[PDB]
Amino acid sequence: GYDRALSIFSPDGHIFQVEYALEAVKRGTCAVGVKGKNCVVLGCERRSTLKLQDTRITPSKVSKIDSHVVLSFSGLNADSRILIEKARVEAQSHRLTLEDPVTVEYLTRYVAGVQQRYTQSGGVRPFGVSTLIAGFDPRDDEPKLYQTEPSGIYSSWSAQTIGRNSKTVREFLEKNYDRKEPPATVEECVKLTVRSLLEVVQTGAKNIEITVVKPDSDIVALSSEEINQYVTQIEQEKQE
Amino acid sequence: NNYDGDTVTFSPTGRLFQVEYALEAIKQGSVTVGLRSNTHAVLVALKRNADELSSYQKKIIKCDEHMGLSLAGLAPDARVLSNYLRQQCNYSSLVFNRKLAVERAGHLLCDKAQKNTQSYGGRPYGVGLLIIGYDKSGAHLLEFQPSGNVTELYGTAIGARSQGAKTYLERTLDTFIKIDGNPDELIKAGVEAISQSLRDESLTVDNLSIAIVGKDTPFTIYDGEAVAKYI
Amino acid sequence: GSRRYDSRTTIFSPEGRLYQVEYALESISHAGTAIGIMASDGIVLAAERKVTSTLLEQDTSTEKLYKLNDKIAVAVAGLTADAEILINTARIHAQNYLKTYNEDIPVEILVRRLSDIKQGYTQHGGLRPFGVSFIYAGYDDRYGYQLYTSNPSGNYTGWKAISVGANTSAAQTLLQMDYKDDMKVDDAIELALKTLSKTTDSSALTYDRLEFATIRKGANDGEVYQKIFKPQEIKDILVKTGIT
Amino acid sequence: MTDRYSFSLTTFSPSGKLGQIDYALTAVKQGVTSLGIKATNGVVIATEKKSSSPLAMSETLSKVSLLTPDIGAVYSGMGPDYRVLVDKSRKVAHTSYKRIYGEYPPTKLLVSEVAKIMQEATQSGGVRPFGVSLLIAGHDEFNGFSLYQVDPSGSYFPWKATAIGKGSVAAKTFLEKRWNDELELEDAIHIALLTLKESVEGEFNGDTIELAIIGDENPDKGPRFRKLTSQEINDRLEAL
Amino acid sequence: TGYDLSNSVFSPDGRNFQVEYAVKAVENGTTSIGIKCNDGVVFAVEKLITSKLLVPQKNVKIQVVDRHIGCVYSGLIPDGRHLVNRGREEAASFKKLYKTPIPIPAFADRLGQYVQAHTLYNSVRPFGVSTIFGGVDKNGAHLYMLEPSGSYWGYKGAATGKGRQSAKAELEKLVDHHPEGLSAREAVKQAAKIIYLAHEDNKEKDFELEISWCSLSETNGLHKFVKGDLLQEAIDFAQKEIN
Amino acid sequence: TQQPIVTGTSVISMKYDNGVIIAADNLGSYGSLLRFNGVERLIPVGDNTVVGISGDISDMQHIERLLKDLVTENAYDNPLADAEEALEPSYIFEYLATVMYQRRSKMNPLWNAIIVAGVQSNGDQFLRYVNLLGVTYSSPTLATGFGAHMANPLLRKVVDRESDIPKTTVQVAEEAIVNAMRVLYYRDARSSRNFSLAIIDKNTGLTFKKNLQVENMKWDFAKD
Amino acid sequence: QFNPYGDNGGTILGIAGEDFAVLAGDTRNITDYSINSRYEPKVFDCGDNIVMSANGFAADGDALVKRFKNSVKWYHFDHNDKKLSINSAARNIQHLLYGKRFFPYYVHTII
Amino acid sequence: DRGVSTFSPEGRLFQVEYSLEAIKLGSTAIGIATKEGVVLGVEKRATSPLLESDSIEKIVEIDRHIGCAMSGLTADARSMIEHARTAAVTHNLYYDEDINVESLTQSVCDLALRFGELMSRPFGVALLIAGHDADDGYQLFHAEPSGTFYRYNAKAIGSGSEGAQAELLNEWHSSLTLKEAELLVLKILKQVMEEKLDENNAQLSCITKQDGFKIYDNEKTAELIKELKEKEAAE
Amino acid sequence: GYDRHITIFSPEGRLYQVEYAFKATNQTNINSLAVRGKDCTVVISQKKVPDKLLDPTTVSYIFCISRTIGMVVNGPIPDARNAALRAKAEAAEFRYKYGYDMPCDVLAKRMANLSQIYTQRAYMRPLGVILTFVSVDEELGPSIYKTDPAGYYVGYKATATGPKQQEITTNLENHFKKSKIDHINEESWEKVVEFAITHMIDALGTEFSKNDLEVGVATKDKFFTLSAENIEERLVAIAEQ
Numbered sequence A: 001g002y003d004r005a006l007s008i009f010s011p012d013g014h015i016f017q018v019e020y021a022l023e024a025v026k027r028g029t030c031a032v033g034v035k036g037k038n039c040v041v042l043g044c045e046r047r048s049t050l051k052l053q054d055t056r057i058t059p060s061k062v063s064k065i066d067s068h069v070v071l072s073f074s075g076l077n078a079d080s081r082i083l084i085e086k087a088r089v090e091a092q093s094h095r096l097t098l099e100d101p102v103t104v105e106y107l108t109r110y111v112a113g114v115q116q117r118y119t120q121s122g123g124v125r126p127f128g129v130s131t132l133i134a135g136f137d138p139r140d141d142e143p144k145l146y147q148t149e150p151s152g153i154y155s156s157w158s159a160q161t162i163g164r165n166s167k168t169v170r171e172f173l174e175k176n177y178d179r180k181e182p183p184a185t186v187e188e189c190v191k192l193t194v195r196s197l198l199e200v201v202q203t204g205a206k207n208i209e210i211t212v213v214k215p216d217s218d219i220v221a222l223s224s225e226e227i228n229q230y231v232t233q234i235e236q237e238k239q240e
Numbered sequence B: 001n002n003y004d005g006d007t008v009t010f011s012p013t014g015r016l017f018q019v020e021y022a023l024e025a026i027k028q029g030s031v032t033v034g035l036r037s038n039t040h041a042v043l044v045a046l047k048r049n050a051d052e053l054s055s056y057q058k059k060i061i062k063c064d065e066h067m068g069l070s071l072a073g074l075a076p077d078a079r080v081l082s083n084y085l086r087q088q089c090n091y092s093s094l095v096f097n098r099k100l101a102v103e104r105a106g107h108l109l110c111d112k113a114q115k116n117t118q119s120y121g122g123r124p125y126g127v128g129l130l131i132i133g134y135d136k137s138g139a140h141l142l143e144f145q146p147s148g149n150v151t152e153l154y155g156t157a158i159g160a161r162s163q164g165a166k167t168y169l170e171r172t173l174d175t176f177i178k179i180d181g182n183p184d185e186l187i188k189a190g191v192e193a194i195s196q197s198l199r200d201e202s203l204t205v206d207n208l209s210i211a212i213v214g215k216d217t218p219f220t221i222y223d224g225e226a227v228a229k230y231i
Numbered sequence C: 001g002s003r004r005y006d007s008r009t010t011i012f013s014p015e016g017r018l019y020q021v022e023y024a025l026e027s028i029s030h031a032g033t034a035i036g037i038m039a040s041d042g043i044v045l046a047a048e049r050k051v052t053s054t055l056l057e058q059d060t061s062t063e064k065l066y067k068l069n070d071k072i073a074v075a076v077a078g079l080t081a082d083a084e085i086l087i088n089t090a091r092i093h094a095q096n097y098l099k100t101y102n103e104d105i106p107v108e109i110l111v112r113r114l115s116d117i118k119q120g121y122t123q124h125g126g127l128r129p130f131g132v133s134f135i136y137a138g139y140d141d142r143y144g145y146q147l148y149t150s151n152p153s154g155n156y157t158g159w160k161a162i163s164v165g166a167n168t169s170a171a172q173t174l175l176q177m178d179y180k181d182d183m184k185v186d187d188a189i190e191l192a193l194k195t196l197s198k199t200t201d202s203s204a205l206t207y208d209r210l211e212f213a214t215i216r217k218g219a220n221d222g223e224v225y226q227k228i229f230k231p232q233e234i235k236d237i238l239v240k241t242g243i244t
Numbered sequence D: 001m002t003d004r005y006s007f008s009l010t011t012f013s014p015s016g017k018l019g020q021i022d023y024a025l026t027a028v029k030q031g032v033t034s035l036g037i038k039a040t041n042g043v044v045i046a047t048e049k050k051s052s053s054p055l056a057m058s059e060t061l062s063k064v065s066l067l068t069p070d071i072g073a074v075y076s077g078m079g080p081d082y083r084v085l086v087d088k089s090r091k092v093a094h095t096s097y098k099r100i101y102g103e104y105p106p107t108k109l110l111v112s113e114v115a116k117i118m119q120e121a122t123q124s125g126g127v128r129p130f131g132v133s134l135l136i137a138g139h140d141e142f143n144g145f146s147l148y149q150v151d152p153s154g155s156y157f158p159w160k161a162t163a164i165g166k167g168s169v170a171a172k173t174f175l176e177k178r179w180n181d182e183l184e185l186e187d188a189i190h191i192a193l194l195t196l197k198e199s200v201e202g203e204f205n206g207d208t209i210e211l212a213i214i215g216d217e218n219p220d221k222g223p224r225f226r227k228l229t230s231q232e233i234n235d236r237l238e239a240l
Numbered sequence E: 001t002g003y004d005l006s007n008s009v010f011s012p013d014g015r016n017f018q019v020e021y022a023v024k025a026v027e028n029g030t031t032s033i034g035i036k037c038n039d040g041v042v043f044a045v046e047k048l049i050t051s052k053l054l055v056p057q058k059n060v061k062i063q064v065v066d067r068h069i070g071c072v073y074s075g076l077i078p079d080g081r082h083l084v085n086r087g088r089e090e091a092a093s094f095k096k097l098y099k100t101p102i103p104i105p106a107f108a109d110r111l112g113q114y115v116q117a118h119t120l121y122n123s124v125r126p127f128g129v130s131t132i133f134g135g136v137d138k139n140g141a142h143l144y145m146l147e148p149s150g151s152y153w154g155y156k157g158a159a160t161g162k163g164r165q166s167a168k169a170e171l172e173k174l175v176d177h178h179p180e181g182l183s184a185r186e187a188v189k190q191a192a193k194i195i196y197l198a199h200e201d202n203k204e205k206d207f208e209l210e211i212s213w214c215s216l217s218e219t220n221g222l223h224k225f226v227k228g229d230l231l232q233e234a235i236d237f238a239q240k241e242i243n
Numbered sequence F: 001t002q003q004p005i006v007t008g009t010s011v012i013s014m015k016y017d018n019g020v021i022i023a024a025d026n027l028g029s030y031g032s033l034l035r036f037n038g039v040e041r042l043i044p045v046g047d048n049t050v051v052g053i054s055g056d057i058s059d060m061q062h063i064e065r066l067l068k069d070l071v072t073e074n075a076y077d078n079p080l081a082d083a084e085e086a087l088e089p090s091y092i093f094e095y096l097a098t099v100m101y102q103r104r105s106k107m108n109p110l111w112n113a114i115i116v117a118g119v120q121s122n123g124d125q126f127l128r129y130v131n132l133l134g135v136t137y138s139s140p141t142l143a144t145g146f147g148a149h150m151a152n153p154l155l156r157k158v159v160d161r162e163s164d165i166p167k168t169t170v171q172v173a174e175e176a177i178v179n180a181m182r183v184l185y186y187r188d189a190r191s192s193r194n195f196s197l198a199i200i201d202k203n204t205g206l207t208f209k210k211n212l213q214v215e216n217m218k219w220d221f222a223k224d
Numbered sequence G: 001q002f003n004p005y006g007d008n009g010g011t012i013l014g015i016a017g018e019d020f021a022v023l024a025g026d027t028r029n030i031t032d033y034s035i036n037s038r039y040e041p042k043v044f045d046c047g048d049n050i051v052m053s054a055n056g057f058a059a060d061g062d063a064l065v066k067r068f069k070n071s072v073k074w075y076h077f078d079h080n081d082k083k084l085s086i087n088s089a090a091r092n093i094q095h096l097l098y099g100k101r102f103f104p105y106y107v108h109t110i111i
Numbered sequence H: 001d002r003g004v005s006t007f008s009p010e011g012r013l014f015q016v017e018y019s020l021e022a023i024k025l026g027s028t029a030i031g032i033a034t035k036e037g038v039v040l041g042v043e044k045r046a047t048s049p050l051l052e053s054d055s056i057e058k059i060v061e062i063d064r065h066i067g068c069a070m071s072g073l074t075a076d077a078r079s080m081i082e083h084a085r086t087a088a089v090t091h092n093l094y095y096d097e098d099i100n101v102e103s104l105t106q107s108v109c110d111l112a113l114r115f116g117e118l119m120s121r122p123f124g125v126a127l128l129i130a131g132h133d134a135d136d137g138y139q140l141f142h143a144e145p146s147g148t149f150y151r152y153n154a155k156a157i158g159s160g161s162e163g164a165q166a167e168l169l170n171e172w173h174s175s176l177t178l179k180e181a182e183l184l185v186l187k188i189l190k191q192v193m194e195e196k197l198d199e200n201n202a203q204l205s206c207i208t209k210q211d212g213f214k215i216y217d218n219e220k221t222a223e224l225i226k227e228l229k230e231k232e233a234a235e
Numbered sequence I: 001g002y003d004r005h006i007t008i009f010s011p012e013g014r015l016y017q018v019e020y021a022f023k024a025t026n027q028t029n030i031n032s033l034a035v036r037g038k039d040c041t042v043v044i045s046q047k048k049v050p051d052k053l054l055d056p057t058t059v060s061y062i063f064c065i066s067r068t069i070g071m072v073v074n075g076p077i078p079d080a081r082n083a084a085l086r087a088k089a090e091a092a093e094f095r096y097k098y099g100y101d102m103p104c105d106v107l108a109k110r111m112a113n114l115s116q117i118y119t120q121r122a123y124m125r126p127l128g129v130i131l132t133f134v135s136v137d138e139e140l141g142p143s144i145y146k147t148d149p150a151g152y153y154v155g156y157k158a159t160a161t162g163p164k165q166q167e168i169t170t171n172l173e174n175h176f177k178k179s180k181i182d183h184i185n186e187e188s189w190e191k192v193v194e195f196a197i198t199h200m201i202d203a204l205g206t207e208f209s210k211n212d213l214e215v216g217v218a219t220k221d222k223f224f225t226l227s228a229e230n231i232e233e234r235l236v237a238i239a240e241q
């Protein structure tokens, strides 16, 4: 087999292939995750360089791993499918042997472990992908939002963004998200997520996708018109 | 220069630079001394600490009841090779009810090190070993280099400043070879030999490591207040 | 050892691009233009052959349009040999699915499979990627008519109309200008040929330089029929649409 | 011995060129002229027996090879590469086809199988491409008479008539003028001998020319492939 | 250029420079010789005494293969040992199948093909040893010498290492002055002399002489080391000839 | 799993004051057919050990080669191959014992019973048994197969326990062995008159005696 | 058919006192009605103040005792000459014996 | 390019030396061994205020008698921890006892040099392995990616390490109490941390014979930080 | 310029390593020649023993592959022996599998197909040798077939190999231009050997002693090499007419 060590240390103590994978994430369309009191919302950018698309069949940016956990990402799209497949398989394998669905932390830890494996295995490059993994643990009403990245590190976030101009939307969320009082309702949480995207998206509701995840496997993706109502309400308040 | 990228490449003067660089790792390692009489064989090792909070890196490893070595250089490689010796010693005992000859032990170490120097991908071992033992032909001392070269000697030293201890032994040769049936006097000569390779630092209680094997003496290591007797 | 001669086909550039994928796309940009257009009552595949001599036997020739099963076809842009490797893999996946579930493979599942293979060559193995971009024209009873494309990166996307190969920038503007959602197959046939007629690097568009195909449910008793157009039929449709 | 060349030696350059395929084609260009012409009732393939020494017995070196009873092959470029392709082509015509279906493969499929082997040398680890272009002439019951070209890339095209190697540009122009869709096999052989005379410097006779036909059955069937004798060629050279 | 950076690469000359660099390591090593006599062979080697701490007679260089073949080499000593280990495996597999002990020409090609194999790939280094070996078989005595390239030939006398030219000159005198042949006991004495004469090229450090021999009359066709009185008799003969 | 085809019968042995004696008849039976009358079943290893082997003859011949090969291998890079680092009976035995048990544990045994008789470096008598199952034991008298039933009773009257070994001379021990071989010839249907005997003494070394015969044969009571 | 097992007889006896223990065994080794040896030791000192016997099929017994003795040696190497406690020895022996669960050591072991 | 297991001309493995540079870039981790216990403490170093800092797990349980703190590319440690845990439990399965801290450390370190062309590169993370056993008492070890491990009375690794080590040099004596060591880790962390030390960006832990390995609550550490501030203001 | 280090195409469509293996062919500085009689095939080759310490009996570049097939090598001896051992192995395996003696040309093509593989696969170098196979084939009669580092192979009426091959080739070409036949019209192999030696003397412009030549002869059902004394007899006959 092809054994060649592609991810290796450089004289200054950096693994360039892992760092160059982060640059592929930087290029990817923006993704955002905001957890409320009783929900998590995953917002995702859709670049409008591609029109004449068929939105019914084009791969959606948020993926279900199980009925209670979702995964969105920024970076290489083809690479994301490999992590999503592996996670979905592990989700069923966990149910099969533990008789209980994965916790969001567990599912995250697995995906992050796969990303890590590719940074010190021969013949393979790291995943050009960072993920936001969100959902609710079984029989638990506390929201969960995790982030992973090519190096294999993962951690828990009150809110987070990844991808292109994530610096700007992280700036926004850092000032607008209060930990002592998070978005109490679904409305507030979705609003704050759309607002944060509108800092970067700079265009209509076709370029914003929203998915709301609630406890007890209650996942729903918002339509264009539902999102467009938030876009209308945000800018009408802004004119003041 | 251009011919030091891997072990598989000869230089234009017939040199293997990776092997020579591995040899260099030994010289950077701490000093250890080996010497023997007709009855006993002694290892003396100056252990090295990282700082004053740290322990002193163990230099001497036991391979069988009648054989063991001291190391200088990459300690993990000494672990790999010592473990390999332990297995060969063990295989001899189990299959042939026979203690492994010290000369044959050296031959096995040589050939294991050699394979790493002729094949692509790997690397030479980055450690030098002094193997002492007492077998069916009396006391023995060996010097192992990771080039593959193993050498039977009356006495020697390897590591940093080891030339001073090596000259001392070269002078003392006729004295210490005659220290038969007296372990303490042979250890004294080994402690006096390793002293010639010291600068600034001197032999303290948790600094010095001594081992001995002989006629009616199993391979036993002495550390701590056990070696205070010889300071 | 061998490391000296390794191109390292599966690495990132400092910018975060996959060198070989980018250069394979550059290869594909020079290949003959292929166009897929999806109508409400069928899909059109049109593609331009390249170099072509008068001595090329056209009726027994297939460099662009291939059949994967009775429901799904592909238009190729890039190395024909590389495409045929992937095609025979796709043809098998379709039959494996049929054998397992006793139902024809859904178009997106087949496409994902091929695209996952292409992805694998960009992340591991140390081999060059496949210098091929596909347009998948297909029908299933979940999503009806579907157009997709995949490229050497292993990324795939769905389309109403799309081009691959040469002059895609020019082709995609002309399609974006004249396409409409209520369009019909006969109109899409005309749009496809008009687009190629303008984007072609040849002096004129003739029957001998074209491969053409339609996937119609337009058959008796609501069943999907693939029609790979014969040389004489491409010549008729060129006269019908008024290009020659 | 580890075959450590598990990585491609043919890769895409920045311009989109596959260097080694292009260079393999350059090798084919330097090779001796061979050609193929398709008649209504047959196909002809021909090439020059470029004798490396006059002491060498050029009868032993067969440039024109039988692949199946109804399929023949000729080449331009590197002879040793051609030889091993003829070996594999003959074998694959038995293993993957005759031993399964109880009949020989049709021309197009055997061509496709050869093309596959040449493609794999263009992408597999630790190999250069084949330095030959093949001209495969053949007949089968449902497709009739056919002539194909196969390049180092693995690409193949069907031809009415064509030429490859040294004087291919000039030879193809010559064929374009002479070819029509009402040629009889004898007319095609006549044209082949004319076309081949242009590219040949030295001696031009049945001993320095190799020429075979796919035609009528020579007495389950008889074989349609027939290699013309040194005498048979010379006879037609008097009516030239 | 760059043709010398990888093993198994033909330079534009037609040469494999990595093999020729292995030869430099051989030329750097101590002197070793072989002398074919009437009914056998004699091997001898220069062992440089680096220090007084080296135990005399202990660091043996000449190696036995099977019970009838002697091997000695100059250059990288571990590479020599690796080649002898393989030779022992070859000689063992031959005897296992064919019953008879391996013939010397047969054994010579077994080493030859193996050393040659290490010039066929860039993933291995060539052998850094010229190996002089031989013994007595059913067809009589045979002396061989095997280079890093895989080249070997039969010899009347052989020599390699740093003192090879000095030795070769001496071997050439013996071949001329004894056409009817040299006896086994004569060859031991001459071997001692030739190592002593070839020590002028390594004259800085003093050395230790080591001799072995196979002879149909003197050792029953088996490889034995020259020890004790016969060794001292040869050293005395050698010491007398230099003075 | 096999079955033994050509077979050798009893190997008998005993310790005496200075060394060990071992003996075995020169027959290779082929079932009831007394096929091969010139089979040596005592195989010396160096000048301090004799391995006596009963059971399958092809497997004996395999073991014979393993021992021949062991001598060769011990000589390699061993300047003391004829002195301090020569093969010992205990080494030779342990090797064979390892082999026999390994082979039984792979369900493919060497179909033999072996007695290794010899004298060690320090002058100690070595006498130990091993068989196709890897079962090992030592005793002042050892015998395989048939001899275990007839030879041991006779030989144990000379050396019944360890304390009798220093009291037994080589003449007494050799007589006892030759007597036992006679008793076996009368009563073992798969034995022969012709045998080999080997004495390994700590002073006089290895004495190997070939072409011996059972004599002094009492048949005269038959005529009645 | 080849039977890999045999019975070499013998009998062993362990008794635990308050500050001591004994392990005894007869020194007779047999097969069927024949005596092989009247003195073939069966109870072994294995080091670390542990005595062991594996009575039954003497080959499997010797094998096991040898393997455990070696396990003691490698426990010293791998854990800084630490004394193998009798409870630890016992668990180590369980894994040695269960290792051949489907081709058992045909012995009743006592330490 | 060049081999992964190549020696430099000084007699060092390049990749090992470069991984040591990665470990210098890591967050600070400090260990202090005493006769009452071994204390492990880490800098959490949250990259943003939105990151929920209790999810930064840089101190980890291997067994009840062995804890572990990490510094460097912390993702690399997961497989090392996994191995350590499996090793500890497996040894208890084979021998019905706790595994010695040195033996555990040695087992972890045996992975370290299993790299070449096995894994493709060394680990980019150093470990402080703290524990207790009956033979050698309370122990602190430093496990590098070179495969070497040193025992330490006290040790700092990561970005603040040479500064912290010099501080540990002066402060450590053989008569330190556990409470003293806790404050001393907090003191030295606060010195070498960029951000101001509190209960949410620093974590303490310890391993005692009685209670085993315990990661400290944020409430418990908060009281020790308040105890530290007052005792530093006290002179 | 790594296209010159391994067996891949240069921009010109060339394999430089193959070309440099062809140059290694003449490194021995030996010329070989092969001719065919009626009943036989004779191969002669220069023998050079520069060292007096060499056992001249072991200095040989002619090999007995099978009983019917002989092989002379132009190139370095280690690669010659590599090729010899493989050809022997192939010829033995052939006889086992197919129940008749491997024909000369079938072996040549086999060794050629192996040589081709080293020109396409990168990890294997070509052998720096040209292999001239000779036999009296039971179907084709007297046979000469030659293989090179490229993997090319072809049958010959006669051939010559080495540094001065062109001189020997043209000398032979001119003789066959006169006789107008593909062989030496001679009953005894002894006289075909005399022809071979004579035409090498004329072509190279050097006289030979018995120890300067090495001769191989193929007849029906055996190939054999001539001793020094057999060659001396051959040289005497040449001189005497």
Ligand SMILES: [Cl-]
Pocket: I109, I110, I113, I114
């Ligand atoms: Cl072949």
